[PDB]
């Protein structure tokens, strides 16, 4: 994004400095470390423009007459026609007939040199400390989203957009250490940095500070200027790119469509002008990030000029002496220096605090039910819903009144047109959704009334879409339940037809499933789902009977191995299969939610209508 | 690394001129930003220190003119900066797009269509801003450098060699920590980007963790990645620490060194006061200008992976290309003729497609059935010449495929992909694709035919309904019924039916599938399928098994003779 509303800034702060808190010695360290080398390193050009008097002093003030006190020899500069000369004299510390004292001048420099050591050391001392904090703030701010993201309940994650948790968990979190950093560091060195050397200058002279504070007005307004009007042409970049991006992603995505029905010259037409667009306007956003950039060093030089001529201009008459113009000028660089950075500082600043933002408003959610402490014993898994009415949305309900009884070695199926909501009877079961009135009992309990832990560990679920992990297939077999030895897993894998593909792979067992992949063909991770499944021993299943890709030797395996993995259990089908649903007891038809049929596909046959039509 | 160069040499080749101007402009700038303490140090030399002060009013004068010259050339330098950046990166990806727009789908599918986008889209972002910053950053550091030492030779050429001792130690130091510091840096963004990938799986798959109650071994992995991630960082942040330190270390024992020996060169006679006043600006100006260099340079090695990715994509050079002499018919029948193709693969040792020979006749579908894994899609995508063969012969009713003019072919051909795919705007547009000049009744019979009718009248917008990114807002039925209307509408002479049957209703698929045959009858059908059920209708269904047409035939003669009929009805039904 180009920019980004903060929608509040105040408080947004000053959470995230109260996140930075717990680490406050190691702020105040950072803090007083930079004081000391701020300090330190604005009394360095003080006593180099003491050595340098100390020079000029000698220099100038060997060739008068010895013998004079510098009285005479001012006098004697005023009689023959100098009197800006003698004023240069009368500035001065001349004594005639001297010139180099190199003892003092050593002396000077030596103590420099000594400061410039402490100086050094305590800058490296301050940013190994800053390192430190920001990393142990950001270690416990990441650990702080990841024990989040494991308490919002699935309304959470279903409600939201495609992947835009993974934005707010991944790059908000990059952006809240930038800045954090940023700030930190630059911001506090800068404003010390700006306030030691005002004092500094205020003690040299009360008039060429005039000079160099006056010149920071403008600075700050041409900065808002360019600012303000470089955000229109930033939209503008991020909109075309946008653009440009969609135009080559679906033009990339369906290449065999594009080039096959003639439309591959309107194609490369359309993306030369979106390429132009996108051209016409990177070049105006990176010229005005430019033009920020030296229009400060601009007004610095003004600055500069001034200081310098007024300077000459006054220790040419003997209100200054020239150690301390030196100094100015010095301190005139380092004061111009951070009013160059000010707008990228508030550039990132600004950016981070909207992160911060984004994350302390994910952050705020509300968990999901506190569940209770007892553990559910499913003995037979005789399922019996009462009275269950299911909304998805408070107001319009999904489910009505419904009274399934589902028994031990039951086959409940569902059956319907794809995309009426089928697993809402799978998100009521695991608890993944709360029912607004009625009663699940499993086998007695309610499935209200037990822990969550236990209840989901003895359902056991084969969804759609086959999740697999970072891993080899032995990690994702032993996922489910990883305290068996290699026997018990072996005994899975072989129970669903796992053995046969990992046979067929160079290194089975410890091929990484994701990483180089390559040859899994999506038919084979549903049966490592599979053997999962049948690894952790469930006792009430729930699970879908859709496909993905038919072959015949993997649809014949899944077909046997989800047939053998429903042993005895009591299971909730999806039915998509004329085998299973002929074999069932209580099979549902959902007209987009709202199951409102019922029977044993024998009085649901007498009385077919939407029912042999759908299996049909 | 060898290729970074070898585009970056290419494709800035028409902005020389541009970066000449810029090299020109800088020179200029920086020149005028060293001239301004000298000009300072002549203030001090022929004004404070003999009684003049019209000199320092001059010399102020000329001051306002240097800095005033300093920031046109510093703008126009930005000016043609941004205007060479950003033609080298309007030409690199259009030079990748043109390339990528002449694949043919095996060479397309080594990338894939999401590694093309970023390589088009995102690794021309990351050259480009290289080549910004090396034409807005980095050209400051030999400039002020040289410059610097000629300036000092020029002012006083008795202390430029503390010039000469105090720019090779700080180059030096730095080369040396950012050495160091470089492969940590690497190290980190590889663990940036772990967990990312552990972050993105627990996202993905948060109805698995529930289930199976695998919360707290998933919060001990996140936690192993984050204290690893960490460690890390702070390693790598241990240089970071050093880097400044040393450049401002520098700078400062160098101007009391420069105090030292310049007294004791004033002394005797030899010098001025304004050179100290002129020497200090010169240490700081030239060794915070190879401080900034140093700090930048740490960006080169992603611009050198990302160049290596684009080369890659820049070099597989295209086998299938339009003929020589296009011989042209003038209108093409359809009587496919396959005679003895292979099709090997790239690189691999097991010839898909081996001694493939049959014809389909002038209007008549044909059913190749067969194993999933014995290469009938390839058979299909290298009739419509996607994909080409590699011995044998294709013929399209008496002319070799490889001999027509491949946009006539492609304008004889209806396909209907695997995978249904809709272009974002409304039905009625990806409708247009295929006639490109669909009267509404002709969108709405080819919507009827097609078993889509229903969905898109029963609908408030009606023939306008947005369509998202690829289809996505629909959903399977729909869009590959869309998809055969789509086809349907061209009323071409070759129906390439890839599967374009299997993600569909068995009711609806006999539904369409009868309509077609209603309004199909006079043009020929390919259809390749694995499930029998759409075969039975066909009239010279075919079979292939490990690349070889091991049963051809009617259906009936078929099931009597060949093991086809129990494998796969048997399976089946």
């Given at each position: 994004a180009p920019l980004e509303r903060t929608?509040?800034?105040?408080?947004?702060?000053?959470?995230?400095?109260?996140?930075?808190?717990?680490?406050?010695?190691?702020?105040?360290?950072?803090?007083?470390?930079?004081?000391?080398?701020?300090?330190?390193?604005?009394?360095?050009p003080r006593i180099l423009g003491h050595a340098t008097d100390l020079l000029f002093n000698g220099v100038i003030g060997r060739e008068l007459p010895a013998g004079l006190t510098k009285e005479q020899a001012v006098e004697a500069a005023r009689a023959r026609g100098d009197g800006t000369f003698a004023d240069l004299l009368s500035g001065?510390?001349?004594?005639?007939?001297?010139?180099?004292?190199?003892?003092?001048?050593?002396?000077?420099?030596?103590?420099?040199?000594?400061?410039?050591?402490?100086?050094?050391?305590?800058?490296?001392?301050?940013?190994?400390?800053?390192?430190?904090?920001?990393?142990?703030?950001?270690?416990?701010?990441?650990?702080?989203?990841?024990?989040?993201?494991?308490?919002?309940?699935?309304?959470?994650?279903?409600?939201?957009?495609?992947?835009?948790?993974?934005?707010?968990?991944?790059?908000?979190?990059?952006?809240?250490?930038?800045?954090?950093?940023?700030?930190?560091?630059?911001?506090?060195?800068?404003?010390?940095?700006?306030?030691?050397?005002?004092?500094?200058?205020?003690?040299?002279?009360?008039?060429?500070?005039?000079?160099?504070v006056v010149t920071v007005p403008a600075s700050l307004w041409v900065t808002r200027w360019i600012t303000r009007r470089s955000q229109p042409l930033f939209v503008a970049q991020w909109r075309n790119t946008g653009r440009l991006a969609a135009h080559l992603e679906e033009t990339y995505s369906g290449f065999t469509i594009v080039k096959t029905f003639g439309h591959r010259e309107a194609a490369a037409g359309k993306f030369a002008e979106l390429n132009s667009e996108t051209q016409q306007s990177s070049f105006g956003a990176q010229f005005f990030s430019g033009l920020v950039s030296p229009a400060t060093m601009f007004i610095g030089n003004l600055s500069y000029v001034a200081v310098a001529v007024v300077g000459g201009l006054q220790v040419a008459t003997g209100q200054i002496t020239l150690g301390s113009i030196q100094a100015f000028i010095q301190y005139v660089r380092q004061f111009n220096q951070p009013l160059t950075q000010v707008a990228g500082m508030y550039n990132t600043l600004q950016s981070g605090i909207a992160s911060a933002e984004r994350v302390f408003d994910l952050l705020d959610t509300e968990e999901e039910s506190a569940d209770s402490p007892r553990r559910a014993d499913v003995r037979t898994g005789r399922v019996e819903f009462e009275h269950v009415s299911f909304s998805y949305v408070p107001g319009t309900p999904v489910i009505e009144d419904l009274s399934l009884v589902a028994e031990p070695g039951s086959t409940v199926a569902i059956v319907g047109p794809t995309g009426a909501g089928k697993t809402t009877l799978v998100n009521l079961l695991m608890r993944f959704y709360d029912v607004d009135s009625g009663r699940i009992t499993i086998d007695g309990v309610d499935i209200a009334s037990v822990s969550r832990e236990s209840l989901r560990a003895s359902i056991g679920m084969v969804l759609?879409?086959?999740?697999?992990?970072?891993?080899?297939?032995?990690?994702?077999?032993?996922?489910?339940?990883?305290?068996?030895?290699?026997?018990?897993?072996?005994?899975?894998?072989?129970?669903?037809?796992?053995?046969?593909?990992?046979?067929?792979?160079?290194?089975?067992?410890?091929?990484?499933?994701?990483?180089?992949?390559?040859?899994?063909?999506?038919?084979?991770?549903?049966?490592?789902?599979?053997?999962?499944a049948v690894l952790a021993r469930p006792k009430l299943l729930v699970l879908d009977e859709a496909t993905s890709s038919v072959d015949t030797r993997t649809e014949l395996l899944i077909a046997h191995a989800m047939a053998e993995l429903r042993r005895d259990r009591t299971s909730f089908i999806i039915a998509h299969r004329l085998s299973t649903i002929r074999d069932a007891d209580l099979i549902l038809v959902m007209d987009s939610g709202r199951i409102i049929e019922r029977g044993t596909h024998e009085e649901l046959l007498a009385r077919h209508g939407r029912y042999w039509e759908m299996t049909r | 690394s060898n290729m970074l160069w070898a585009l970056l040499r290419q494709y800035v080749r028409p902005?020389?001129?541009?970066?000449?101007?810029?090299?020109?402009?800088?020179?200029?700038?920086?020149?005028?930003?060293?001239?301004?303490?000298?000009?300072?140090?002549?203030?001090?030399?022929?004004?404070?220190?003999?009684?003049?002060?019209?000199?320092?009013?001059?010399?102020?004068?000329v001051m306002l003119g240097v800095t005033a010259l300093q920031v046109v050339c510093a703008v126009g330098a930005?000016?043609?900066?941004?205007?060479?950046?950003?033609?080298?990166?309007?030409?690199?990806?259009?030079?990748?797009?043109?390339?990528?727009?002449?694949?043919?789908?095996?060479?397309?599918?080594?990338?894939?269509?999401?590694?093309?986008?970023?390589?088009?889209?995102?690794?021309?972002?990351?050259?480009?801003?290289?080549?910004?910053?090396?034409?807005?950053?980095?050209?400051?550091?030999?400039?002020?450098?040289?410059?610097?030492?000629?300036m000092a030779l020029h002012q006083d050429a008795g202390l430029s060699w503390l010039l000469l001792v105090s720019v090779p130690v700080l180059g030096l130091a730095n080369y040396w920590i950012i050495r160091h510091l470089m492969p940590v840096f690497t190290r980190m963004q590889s663990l940036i980007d772990g967990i990312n990938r552990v972050l993105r799986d627990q996202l993905s798959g948060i109805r698995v963790i529930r289930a199976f109650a695998r919360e707290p071994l998933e919060r001990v992995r996140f936690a192993e990645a984050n204290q690893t991630l960490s460690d890390?960082?702070?390693?790598?942040?241990?240089?970071?620490?050093?880097?400044?330190?040393?450049?401002?270390?520098?700078?400062?024992?160098?101007?009391?060194?420069?105090?030292?020996?310049?007294?004791?060169?004033?002394?005797?006679?030899?010098?001025?006061?304004?050179?100290?006043?002129?020497?200090?600006?010169?240490?700081?100006?030239?060794?915070?200008?190879?401080?900034?260099?140093?700090?930048?340079?740490?960006?080169?090695?992603?611009?050198?992976?990302?160049?290596?990715?684009?080369?890659?994509?820049?070099?597989?050079?295209?086998?299938?290309?339009?003929?020589?002499?296009?011989?042209?018919?003038?209108?093409?029948?359809?009587?496919?003729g396959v005679h003895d193709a292979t099709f090997c693969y790239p690189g691999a040792d097991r010839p898909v497609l081996q001694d493939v020979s049959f014809t389909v006749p002038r209007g008549t579908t044909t059913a190749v059935v067969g194993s999933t894994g014995s290469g009938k899609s390839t058979l299909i995508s290298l009739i419509c010449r996607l994909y080409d063969v590699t011995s044998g012969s294709l013929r399209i009713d008496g002319v070799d495929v490889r001999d027509l003019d491949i946009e006539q072919l492609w304008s004889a051909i209806g396909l209907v992909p695997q995978r249904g795919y809709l272009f974002s705007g409304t039905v009625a547009e990806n409708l247009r694709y295929g006639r490109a000049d669909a009267t509404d009744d002709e969108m709405w019979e080819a919507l009827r035919v097609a078993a889509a009718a229903d969905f898109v009248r029963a609908h408030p917008?009606?023939?306008?309904?947005?369509?998202?990114?690829?289809?996505?807002?629909?959903?399977?039925?729909?869009?590959?019924?869309?998809?055969?209307?789509?086809?349907?509408?061209?009323?071409?002479?070759?129906?390439?039916?890839?599967?374009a049957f299997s993600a569909l209703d068995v009711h609806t698929d006999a539904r369409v599938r009868d309509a077609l045959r209603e309004v199909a009858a006079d043009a020929t059908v390919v259809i390749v399928s694995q499930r029998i059920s759409t075969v039975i209708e066909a009239d010279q269904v075919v079979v292939i098994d490990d690349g070889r047409v091991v049963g051809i035939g009617t259906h009936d003669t078929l099931l009597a003779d060949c093991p086809i009929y129990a494998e796969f009805a048997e399976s089946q039904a």
């Open positions: 929608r509040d800034f105040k408080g947004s702060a000053i959470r995230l400095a109260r996140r930075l808190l717990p680490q406050r010695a190691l702020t105040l360290a950072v803090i007083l470390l930079g004081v000391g080398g701020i300090a330190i390193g604005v009394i360095g001065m510390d001349i004594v005639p007939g001297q010139g180099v004292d190199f003892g003092a001048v050593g002396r000077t420099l030596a103590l420099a040199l000594g400061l410039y050591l402490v100086a050094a050391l305590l800058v490296w001392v301050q940013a190994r400390l800053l390192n430190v904090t920001v990393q142990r703030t950001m270690v416990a701010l990441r650990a702080e989203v990841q024990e989040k993201i494991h308490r919002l309940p699935l309304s959470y994650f279903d409600s939201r957009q495609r992947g835009e948790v993974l934005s707010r968990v991944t790059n908000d979190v990059d952006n809240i250490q930038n800045s954090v950093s940023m700030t930190i560091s630059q911001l506090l060195t800068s404003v010390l940095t700006v306030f030691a050397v005002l004092v500094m200058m205020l003690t040299i002279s009360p008039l060429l500070t005039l000079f160099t759609q879409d086959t999740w697999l992990f970072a891993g080899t297939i032995y990690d994702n077999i032993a996922y489910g339940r990883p305290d068996a030895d290699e026997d018990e897993v072996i005994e899975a894998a072989t129970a669903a037809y796992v053995d046969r593909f990992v046979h067929t792979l160079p290194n089975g067992y410890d091929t990484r499933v994701d990483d180089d992949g390559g040859a899994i063909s999506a038919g084979e991770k549903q049966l490592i789902t599979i053997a999962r | 902005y020389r001129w541009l970066l000449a101007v810029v090299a020109v402009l800088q020179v200029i700038s920086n020149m005028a930003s060293l001239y301004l303490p000298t000009v300072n140090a002549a203030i001090i030399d022929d004004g404070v220190a003999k009684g003049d002060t019209a000199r320092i009013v001059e010399l102020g004068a930005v000016f043609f900066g941004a205007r060479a950046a950003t033609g080298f990166g309007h030409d690199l990806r259009a030079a990748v797009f043109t390339h990528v727009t002449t694949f043919s789908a095996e060479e397309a599918g080594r990338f894939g269509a999401a590694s093309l986008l970023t390589r088009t889209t995102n690794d021309v972002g990351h050259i480009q801003q290289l080549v910004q910053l090396t034409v807005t950053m980095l050209i400051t550091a030999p400039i002020m450098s040289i410059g610097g030492i000629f890390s960082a702070l390693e790598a942040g241990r240089w970071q620490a050093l880097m400044l330190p040393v450049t401002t270390l520098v700078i400062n024992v160098s101007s009391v060194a420069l105090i030292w020996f310049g007294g004791l060169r004033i002394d005797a006679g030899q010098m001025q006061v304004g050179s100290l006043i002129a020497f200090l600006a010169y240490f700081m100006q030239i060794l915070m200008a190879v401080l900034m260099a140093t700090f930048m340079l740490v960006i080169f090695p992603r611009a050198a992976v990302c160049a290596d990715r684009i080369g890659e994509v820049l070099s597989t050079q295209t086998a299938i290309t339009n003929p020589a002499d296009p011989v042209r018919p003038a209108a093409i029948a359809g009587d496919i917008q009606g023939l306008d309904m947005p369509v998202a990114q690829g289809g996505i807002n629909f959903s399977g039925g729909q869009r590959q019924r869309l998809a055969i209307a789509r086809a349907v509408i061209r009323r071409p002479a070759i129906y390439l039916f890839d599967d």
